[PDB]
Amino acid sequence: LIYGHKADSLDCSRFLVEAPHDWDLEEVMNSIRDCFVTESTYFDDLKGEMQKQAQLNRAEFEDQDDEARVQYEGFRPGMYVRIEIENVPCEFVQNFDPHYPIILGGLGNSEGNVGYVQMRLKKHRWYKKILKSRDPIIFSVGWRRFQTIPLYYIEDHNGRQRLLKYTPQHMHCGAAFWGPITPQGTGFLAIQSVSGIMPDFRIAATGVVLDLDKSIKIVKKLKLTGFPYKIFKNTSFIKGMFNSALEVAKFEGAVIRTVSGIRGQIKKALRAPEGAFRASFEDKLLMSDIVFMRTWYPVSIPAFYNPVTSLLKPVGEKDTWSGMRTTGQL
Amino acid sequence: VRMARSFHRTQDLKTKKHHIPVVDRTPLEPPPIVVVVMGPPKVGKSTLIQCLIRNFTRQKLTEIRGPVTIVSGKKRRLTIIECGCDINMMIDLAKVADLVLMLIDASFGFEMETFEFLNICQVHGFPKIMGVLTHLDSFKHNKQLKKTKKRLKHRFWTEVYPGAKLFYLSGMVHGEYQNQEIHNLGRFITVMKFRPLTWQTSHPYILADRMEDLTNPEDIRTNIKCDRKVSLYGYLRGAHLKNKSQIHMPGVGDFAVSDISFLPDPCALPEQQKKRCLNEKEKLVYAPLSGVGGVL
Amino acid sequence: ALKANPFGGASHAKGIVLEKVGVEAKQPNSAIRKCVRVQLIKNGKKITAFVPNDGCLNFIEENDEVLVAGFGRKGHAVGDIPGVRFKVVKVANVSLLALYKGKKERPR
Amino acid sequence: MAAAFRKAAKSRQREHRERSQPGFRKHLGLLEKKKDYKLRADDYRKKQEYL
């Protein structure tokens, strides 16, 4: 009945009573009568529970036939099986080489989707060069092999993630990129180029996958620079940071400072040049000083995902696979 | 005092036993163990495969291609595959391998490919590893041979867990290794036990033994570039597989399985009996891409 | 008093890392930051363990298996914090010192 | 082994370097840092306390 008008109806998870009992006669009351009341360590107990579940899993569907068992629990490990795959590219069959193994990995829930993946990354100790941010790199994660463009970022104690130009030489570093969904806690490996042979070590970096999300939330530090032109003890007049009186109105009260380390405050715009303003400071400034204000600007990453298709190559050139080149190669 | 020492010794022994408990999901009848053979390009990878096969089956094999499935003992079967120097293929096998046989040239020493594969194994889940070093016949049974054995062993124990066996192959009689060393090597493979890896337990996977093209032949003549329906056979490993699911084939792309159906097991285990040794009937070789006897 | 000590008479103990209380709070003390919470396997007790140096926190992630040893002396070395009685020695049966120096790689 | 961790970290002794004045403002003088301004700041504080 389950596995062998109604639409536009109320969505209530309530069981309506088709035929209620009288509940006045004793005989109906009688049917409900019985329903009412008239030294091991923690490691040993946890093992004892797990062993109980282990037997129950094995001894459940034994009675049913194998065709029945396939319906309830799927194809179990250890059964020789035949799979039909449709829409295989023609280049696969024509260029098939028996030496190269063919592997079929079942995908979990949502693993077909793509999203933003955050990883904890460390450059390998034996690799000569370092990895530059915003350059193509090939990852081996889960079952897949693909080339993407990552962003390398470092965490701060308050929780901000600021962009890094390069991977640090001997420290862990965050990595963010756009790619397939992969369960957390898995290892990943990075190479620069699969094609060709290199005398040196080819494994670039190693780490673990941390987070799955749809927003990167990474920021980059931006400093706007100004120069004094008139000095009145603490108060000094600054030019060169802004270029309109509308602009200065946006940034009133912002904290600014010099190279020397004197902290200051934006006070009010000036009219005599286009974009100057009045700013007070802790102490008197010199003409040589340069003032700047620290602001954070969010960044973004291009969505580029290039899976490797080494098997879809002629028998002679399965080694030579090429993709986007890095900045140095260009 | 002595009972206090005995008490403290037992507690330290218990500490090694402690680990996170987990449900035991191993199959009642496990599939054949996957054994990969790798090394530097000209170390002797394919020679070792033939010696291992001749040790167990007495069947003639020529032009070995793809995985080879044989019966090795009453309760264990092996699947044998060779791994080349290609970086792409080296990565794929590390995901699926259950046993790794690493080949080392004793005269030359360590090479890059030996260390690269070990790092890949640590990333994707470390399988059981036994190192086999060859070319020991060049030395002259002197201090030089004695120290080379010790020097290569100590450097090897840092890559893997301590106590991982290192096997020695003395020399070649007539282009084949001596029968005694191969027999001792086969005993170690027989008696290993394997830990459950996180990735391999979570996801079902198949190492396909045979490939077959299933299309209408008139469609190919019409357009040779047409998308083709292809059927694959293999042993199911890891976890259960549903009828309609998404599968990823590395090096090709993502696909969804159209139909799934099981077949009677080839190279199956014997029905239990108390004969001392397996007769020629029980020793079976399944190699659909390799060619058994003379036919390829 | 044969089983008096929290390790149950053993020299070390094994636990599962529950969370990093020090990192989760945003105090940049570096004496708070090196406190982790682990649950001993043998008896299930929850304790707070110390990481020898900041930057070894990177090698540890959630739900790992660690080996915990006592902190006998030099408790005053850390800056003004009580309860410094435990320290993390191994993760995945690999020493923290070996991992930091780049002598070994953690096996997954 | 707290000191052992410290010794390994301090193996590299390259220290962060200082930036100079930009060229197009060279005639103004040297870009003062915290070490230089502190000399000028303590000088003022001594005289104002004396007056």
Partner: peptide, 20 residues
């Protein structure tokens, strides 16, 4: 065509303090 290991890989000295 053989890729022999470098000196750094052979002796994984790592981060060891430099001494006179």
């Amino acid at each position: 065509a053989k890729r022999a290991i470098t000196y750094q890989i052979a002796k994984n000295r790592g981060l060891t303090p430099r001494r006179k």
